[PDB]
Structures are given as C-alpha cells and as structure tokens.
Design a protein around this ligand. Sequence first.
Ligand SMILES: *[C@H]1OC[C@@H](O[C@@H]2OC[C@@H](O)[C@H](O)[C@H]2O)[C@H](O)[C@H]1O
Length: 427
Amino acid sequence: AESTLGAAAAQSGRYFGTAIASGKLGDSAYTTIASREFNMVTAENEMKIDATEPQRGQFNFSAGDRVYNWAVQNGKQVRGHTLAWHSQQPGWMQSLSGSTLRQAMIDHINGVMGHYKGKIAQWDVVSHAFSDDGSGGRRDSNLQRTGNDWIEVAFRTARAADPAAKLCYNDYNIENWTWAKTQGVYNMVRDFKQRGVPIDCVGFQSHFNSGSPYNSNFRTTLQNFAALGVDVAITELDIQGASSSTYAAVTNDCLAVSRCLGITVWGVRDTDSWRSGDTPLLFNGDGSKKAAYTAVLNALNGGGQIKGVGSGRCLDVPNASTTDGTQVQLYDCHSATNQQWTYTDAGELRVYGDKCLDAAGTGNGTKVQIYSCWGGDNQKWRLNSDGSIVGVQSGLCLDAVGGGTANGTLIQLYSCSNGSNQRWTRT
Ligand SMILES: *[C@H]1OC[C@@H](O[C@@H]2OC[C@@H](O)[C@H](O)[C@H]2O)[C@H](O)[C@H]1O
C-alpha cells in the first residue's frame, strides 16, 4: 500500500503517526483523516500525569482509554506519554518534593503502566529533563531536586512495571548535533547503556521553526544515538510553514536510520495544532492535503518547463505577459522565461519570480492563470507521482481544456481522471 502515510511508512517497517485529542474524536472530518492516514497514535494530553492521576493515588483513565481504544480499534499502535516530567503535573504533585516526590513518581509510573501493561509499543518514561540555557545540564525542577538519579530510577521502575514496552527518553532542541543540550542527552544515554540502565529509545520532539531550525545534521544526531544501541523516534514533528523540502528532509532522515522506528507529527490538521499560527502540519483546517503531504508521501514511497504528456507542449504564459488574470496555455516548448516554472517550499508554481500559477475558483472549468503570489491555497499545488498536478484548495487537477493539444489550448481545473491532458513531466 502506498496512498496513505502510515501504509507508505509500513513498506519499510516503520510507522507514521499523529497526536490524537480525545475531544476531537466526535469530529467526523478529524477522524476520517486520522483513521485513514496514521498507524501510530500518541494521546496529546490524556495519558499525562494530571490527566491520569488528578488526585494522589486516584487514577483516572477515562480519556486515556478512549484514545487508546480508538487507536487499537482503528489499527494503530500506541506511544504512551508521559510518565514522569516537570510539566502538566497535577496541583498536588507540584507541591511535593524530596523523598515523598520520588515515591509519588514511582507510584504514578506503576499505576499508569500497570493499567496499560503489555498494550503499549513505546512509553516516553521521562521527557524534557534538560535545560536550554546552553550548559547541557539538567532542567531545574521538583523532580530534579529529588536527586540527579530520578531519571535512572524512573526507567528502572518502568522496565519492571511493563517489560514489553520500549522505554524512551524524549526531549526537544536535541536535534542539532552541535548544541550543548543534544550532547547532554547523548552523554546521559551513553552512560545509561554502559551501566545497564534500561532504556530502549530516544525520542526527538522535532519542533522546527525559525527560532530552532531544522539542520541536516539531525540525521547525524539520529545515527549517533542509534550507534549507542538504542532505537530513535521522531515524536512531535511539526515544521513552521510546513515547508515541503523540510518535511521531505526529515522523512528521509528517518528512512536513512535503520533504528528509526517511525515519525509522529504533532496533530492532524493545522487547526488542531498547539501552534496553529505556524500552520506546521500536513493537512489544512478544511481537511485538504498540503503540498508537504505529497512531499512526505513521495519520500516514504522511495521517490524548469512543465510539459504536457498528451500534447508534448509546455505550460506557457501567453506572449510572456506578466498581467494578473492571464490564463495559461499549452505552447511549443522553447527557451523563454514565460515557460520557466519554479516549485517552492510553500507549494507554489512561480514564474517571473513573483507571479503564481493561480486557480480563479474551485470547480470544474475554473480558469488557471498567473496572479501575484500571496499565499492562498488556490496558488498551492501538489505534484503527484503519476504526473498530475492537483490544486490544494480545489482538489482538482491541472487540465488542458477539452483534451486540446495544439498551441493556445487553455488550462483549467478539472476532476482528476488520469488522462494524458492532466499528466505533466518536469525535465
Ligand atoms: C512535546 O511538546 C508538545 C507537548 O504537547 C502539548 O503539551 C501542552 C498542551 O497544552 C498541548 O495541547 C499539547 O499539544 C508534548 O506533551 C511534549 O512531549
């Protein structure tokens, strides 16, 4: 199978997952996409400490079980998270400290893991334990104040609680190999493996934006950790603006590491994101697949002028016009700027540098023209492996009107048909 993300990843023994919010399971649009595209689920908040143990010794798995059951019933494995960390702690735990906090941490781990014993693929036992001050040291938290060995203890407790689950340490800003934080985690994990501390995986949040940009050395980081004898997982992937190249790059980084179990994007649609303003996911709020979706699918499947297959002619802007609203056409291919299209990270097909292939509407027969670039979804396109070019907003294919092949044949949007007048080659 290769038409959905999860299935595409499965071809190499990997998964492609998402974060599921129990509060959205009653949303048909949400579940239709989530059940179809992902084969791994992480509860966005339902399995955290405050959600599972609202009162000391009083566990509640109502929300957690709804996410877990939805996942398994729809064919997805589950990553549990998170058993012990400084954030989202219930009020009672925040006030605890020292030895009492240490015991509370242990009791929580046993309670939650015991409830899901043998049903969880991976557990983020500890998360976000290192600082961002640039010292590569531990984060100052109530948990850290109970002893630097709290993390080690958490893992030993976890292994005993459920020996069938892979135990992971998860964190962010540990993707770039040159950062001190990355080194701090690397050294801790190396020490753990050397001393026999039970740890099976390292999770990389992979939250990329201009403040903490993706860097190609992420692959090196993954490979260095894999070399320590642990699996690695991309746990909360999201990319500011959802750059197609960056999404494909991260996808290929996991594919390049034998021990990379899979990739989880932090949310289904941009509107479901904890950082929606950065439209960092693979689906738009209206459910349409973004340019990055196709880039990722293509990568998982192991994947200038734009020439029509049926006509042998090139996508051309009539008389090299730069006027907004000029409908594009098919024309004999030749070296000219009005036939030179550039596919951008945002999914646009640009010409002249700042003009965009633009759909004047959303239905069959819609005029395809050039228009000033502004970021609209009617200016975004997905380059399918079969040669078709689909509009993100419309879901319709670039189509040479009436199947025409002669110079002057206009271009429109039309229901995809796999026809030769809808197939294009880029060379
Ligand atoms: C990685 O970062 C994102 C965390 O998830 C968010 O936590 C805060 C919630 O308010 C928000 O809804 C969640 O998406 C995740 O737990 C971390 O591991």
